[PDB]
Amino acid sequence: MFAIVKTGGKQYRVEPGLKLRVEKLDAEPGATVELPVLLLGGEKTVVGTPVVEGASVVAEVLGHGRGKKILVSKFKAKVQYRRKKGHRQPYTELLIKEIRG
Amino acid sequence: MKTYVPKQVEPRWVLIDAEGKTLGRLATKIATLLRGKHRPDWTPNVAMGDFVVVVNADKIRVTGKKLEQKIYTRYSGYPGGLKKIPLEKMLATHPERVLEHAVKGMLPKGPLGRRLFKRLKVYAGPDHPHQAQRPEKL
Amino acid sequence: PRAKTGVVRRRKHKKILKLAKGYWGLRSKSFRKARETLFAAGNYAYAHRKRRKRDFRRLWIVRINAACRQHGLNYSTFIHGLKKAGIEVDRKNLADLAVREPQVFAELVERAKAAQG
Amino acid sequence: RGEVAYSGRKIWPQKHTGRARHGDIGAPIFVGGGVVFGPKPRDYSYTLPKKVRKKGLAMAVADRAREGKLLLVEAFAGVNGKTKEFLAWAKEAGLDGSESVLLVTGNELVRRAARNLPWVVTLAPEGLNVYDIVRTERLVMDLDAWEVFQNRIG
Amino acid sequence: AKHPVPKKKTSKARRDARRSHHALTPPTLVPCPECKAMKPPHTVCPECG
Amino acid sequence: MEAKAIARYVRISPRKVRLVVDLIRGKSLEEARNILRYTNKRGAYFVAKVLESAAANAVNNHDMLEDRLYVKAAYVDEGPALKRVLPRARGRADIIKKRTSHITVILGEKHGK
Amino acid sequence: MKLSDLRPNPGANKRRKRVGRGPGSGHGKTATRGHKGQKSRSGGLKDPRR
RNA sequence: CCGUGAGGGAAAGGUGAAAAGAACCCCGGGAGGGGAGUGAAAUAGAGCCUGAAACCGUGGGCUUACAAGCAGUCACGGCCCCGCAAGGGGUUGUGGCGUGCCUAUUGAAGCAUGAGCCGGCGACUCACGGUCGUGGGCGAGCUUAAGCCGUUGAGGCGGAGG
RNA sequence: GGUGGAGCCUGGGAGUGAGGGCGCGAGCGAUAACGUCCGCGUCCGAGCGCGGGAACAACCGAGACCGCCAGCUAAGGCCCC
RNA sequence: GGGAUGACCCCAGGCGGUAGGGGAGCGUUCCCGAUGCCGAUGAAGGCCGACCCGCGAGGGCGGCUGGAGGUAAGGGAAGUG
Ligand SMILES: [Mg+2]
Ligand SMILES: [Mg+2]
Ligand SMILES: [Mg+2]
Ligand SMILES: [Mg+2]
Ligand SMILES: [Mg+2]
Ligand SMILES: [Mg+2]
Ligand SMILES: [Mg+2]
Ligand SMILES: [Mg+2]
Ligand SMILES: [Mg+2]
Ligand SMILES: [Mg+2]
Ligand SMILES: [Mg+2]
Ligand SMILES: [Mg+2]
Ligand SMILES: [Mg+2]
Ligand SMILES: [Mg+2]
Ligand SMILES: [Mg+2]
Ligand SMILES: [Mg+2]
Ligand SMILES: [Mg+2]
Ligand SMILES: [Mg+2]
Ligand SMILES: [Mg+2]
Ligand SMILES: [Mg+2]
Ligand SMILES: [Mg+2]
Ligand SMILES: [Mg+2]
Ligand SMILES: [Mg+2]
Ligand SMILES: [Mg+2]
Ligand SMILES: [Mg+2]
Ligand SMILES: [Mg+2]
Ligand SMILES: [Mg+2]
Ligand SMILES: [Mg+2]
Ligand SMILES: [Mg+2]
Ligand SMILES: [Mg+2]
Ligand SMILES: [Mg+2]
Ligand SMILES: [Mg+2]
Ligand SMILES: [Mg+2]
Ligand SMILES: [Mg+2]
Ligand SMILES: [Mg+2]
Ligand SMILES: [Mg+2]
Ligand SMILES: [Mg+2]
Ligand SMILES: [Mg+2]
Ligand SMILES: [Mg+2]
Ligand SMILES: [Mg+2]
Ligand SMILES: [Mg+2]
């Protein structure tokens, strides 16, 4: 019994009781946001249109994050050109509780 | 959400007749089956393939003048070492091999590409080794 | 007052060889071959990140194009089902549908085989 | 490379030796050769505008005054300098020596009393300088000094 | 003839691979039919020939 | 319990001697003894002297019972090399390294319940 | 005023263009002399005011 | 030490608080080591403080004999380790992708220069003038040089001059 | 009309003063040259960073701040590699 | 814009780059801070780290080694990478 939901510009397949790492968003931890956006019910025939309406999935912000740092580097030969920049991409963690029609 | 990847699958066999199929026309699919690019679980590195068997290999047919005009070429190492074999000569010498070649060329290159071609067993005329299942596409 | 090199050059050179662990031959054992090796890995990893995104989509597609070729159609046409069929929802990411949840997929074929047609 | 002990001789012929190319060995590129652009004796003195030195003296006192840290005194009586005697007059004057003091007086014997205290620095009044004011928490002068401090400035 | 010279330094890999044949073979010995000790065949035992 | 003996500063080139060392690693003392006698290398002598000093060391100081021991570990390291000038044609003058070994034999007792 | 809080104004001991030194400062390698010929050379040019 | 000579001309410092510098015993011709002993410490044992890197070796885990390569990178998997866990570290099988660094050039992987590797040494300074800017001081003015007085690293005076 | 990493003025600091390919217009050449010399554009230079052109500075596509296992397209493609 | 006078939050735009210009920082040796403070319950230096802070140069922290030094905030000066 699953869903298909949209956040941060991606689709993810969510379940009751699923810790899902998602693009950072505005909430203080512990708050709840139904994301009024839901694309697919997992009991089938509810599918379609951008979003099957009235539905939503209730999930709770477990707190925000910064992922393992990416060292992203640029080198250009014979031009004496190098650049280093460190990057860790912010995220928020979620627990997917309830599928609401 | 991480993409699904298959654990070790059931190595399903297949059967093809070839008689009166064209060649590169017939070959195209033999590749896609060897690959297993037709299975929803398709994976580039693993080779979840089919094991494709072909019979009546003498009996493939092709258009144009190709039976006379089309030449096969083999370098050895040595000066004057290029050998040139016209299609028809091949057919009466080692039939198949022509299909074997058409497919091997259509398979990828590398260690895995080399494995898949092992998984194509091509026989001349009817019959074959009788082990597995083999549903027949025509 | 003079400031001779002392400890600076050793430390810098170490920063780098640490990054180079695992590399073949001198490329892991020598500050020059380490540094040269790294630049390479640097531009690669970057570029291969862009290319990872490309890499996956092409996998997704083959899988789809294969699976609805059991249900008898083009990938090419399939997507023009959903363009019009409003089922503009996606995918192509999911594709676990095609594998894991087939009749969910099949239903999506149907919603797609009738689109303004 | 000019002043280093070695000879002026060309170390190698300069072609066909298959080696690199070289002059005398006082060359800075050689271990043990000359130093490039390193230090020579030099004079770091300059001249501050005298008006700036007046002002700074004023300002720096004033700041000690504005903190209440300044104290004038008449005459001591912790004189005939022995630092036993000083440490009394000082205690009576509310100087714990929890705060570093600068003591300015023209009295030889008072000066030489204090010198040895870990928290006291000491000067004649002509010796007055903003550096010594600022390192020290409290400033203390007698009037013989304070006068000339004024007759200094103006 | 001019003067061949190695063009690259041999990697530690290619020299150690060279040496893959250099190991010795322990000498071949029989128990001496007179004395207790070990000896090489078709030879006079260093103790009591 | 194990016992070892090291000969330091042997004037021998490690590559040369490391060779016979590999010939005894792991063998019981009785054969290693037999192996070096009938092995033909200048290195065979030297390795034997260390081998023995380690057996001696074992049974005396370490109370280890001479008939139960084998060669547990053995290895040779490269001690400081001796540089001499080698006069060469056309005034040339090379330098040969007369090299130096640190031989280590380590003995242990065969489990031998 | 303590010796700690003394310090100069935000202009005032500007300090200082030295390179020289790395890529990344800019002023690497050629050290702003820019490749070239006589001007790049050590005693460089000929007195441009004339 | 090199040069007939004038002359050239180096390398090379550190046990420990104290020699208490390892009696004696064992292997050995010696060297060397193993015990014992000394010491707070002996991988501080005289080839002696710290003891980096290239370099050489022993042991262990992963890997490798139908594959092709600037040696990396991106993905999945396998075996090994660390953590309750989701997770992390090692390794590399296959798959995608991929023309070393510097320098000089219109143009270089370039079959164009330089570099065997590692460590240390190695190149935009300083004086006096100048010209812009900037932080402050004083402003129809500004400012002293030599020198003279005085000083726990004390500052003042000095108006020639500019 | 046009608010633009536009314009003008005074000043401080430069680097450059070997260019090259392509298109169009001419000259020299042979209605030769990856030839040479000017003009107007362009790109490489410095975008040997990305996509296409098998591979390839300068031809087609497009001006790469960083991340994503999301979407639409450009050139060029949709039998298999 | 908001009136905090900024250092903070929202909005919107730019951010390929060689010669070269401008701008902020990091690190090294030394001086004032210092008759102070850290330190044998372990200085500097060395070896690991999958940990925290920083865009980065860097800084932290932990463990092992090492055995007598080190030296804040804030400034000054150079034989400074
Ligand atoms: Mg390149
Ligand atoms: Mg270039
Ligand atoms: Mg230096
Ligand atoms: Mg894209
Ligand atoms: Mg001289
Ligand atoms: Mg001399
Ligand atoms: Mg001389
Ligand atoms: Mg001289
Ligand atoms: Mg001369
Ligand atoms: Mg040479
Ligand atoms: Mg010398
Ligand atoms: Mg000198
Ligand atoms: Mg000859
Ligand atoms: Mg020959
Ligand atoms: Mg000879
Ligand atoms: Mg001679
Ligand atoms: Mg040699
Ligand atoms: Mg620059
Ligand atoms: Mg600049
Ligand atoms: Mg310049
Ligand atoms: Mg140059
Ligand atoms: Mg030029
Ligand atoms: Mg000149
Ligand atoms: Mg002589
Ligand atoms: Mg001593
Ligand atoms: Mg002895
Ligand atoms: Mg003791
Ligand atoms: Mg010992
Ligand atoms: Mg130690
Ligand atoms: Mg020690
Ligand atoms: Mg030594
Ligand atoms: Mg000491
Ligand atoms: Mg030592
Ligand atoms: Mg080492
Ligand atoms: Mg090994
Ligand atoms: Mg084969
Ligand atoms: Mg194999
Ligand atoms: Mg690969
Ligand atoms: Mg070069
Ligand atoms: Mg050149
Ligand atoms: Mg040239």
Ligand SMILES: [Mg+2]
């Ligand atoms: Mg040229």
Ligand SMILES: [Mg+2]
């Ligand atoms: Mg080259």
Ligand SMILES: [Mg+2]
């Ligand atoms: Mg080459």
Ligand SMILES: [Mg+2]
């Ligand atoms: Mg040249």
Ligand SMILES: [Mg+2]
């Ligand atoms: Mg060069």
Ligand SMILES: [Mg+2]
């Ligand atoms: Mg060469």
Ligand SMILES: [Mg+2]
């Ligand atoms: Mg050489």
Ligand SMILES: [Mg+2]
């Ligand atoms: Mg170096």
Ligand SMILES: [Mg+2]
């Ligand atoms: Mg000047």
Ligand SMILES: [Mg+2]
């Ligand atoms: Mg100036």
Ligand SMILES: [Mg+2]
């Ligand atoms: Mg000025």
Ligand SMILES: [Mg+2]
């Ligand atoms: Mg002014």
Ligand SMILES: [Mg+2]
């Ligand atoms: Mg005046």
Ligand SMILES: [Mg+2]
């Ligand atoms: Mg402009």
Ligand SMILES: [Mg+2]
């Ligand atoms: Mg200008």
Ligand SMILES: [Mg+2]
């Ligand atoms: Mg010109």
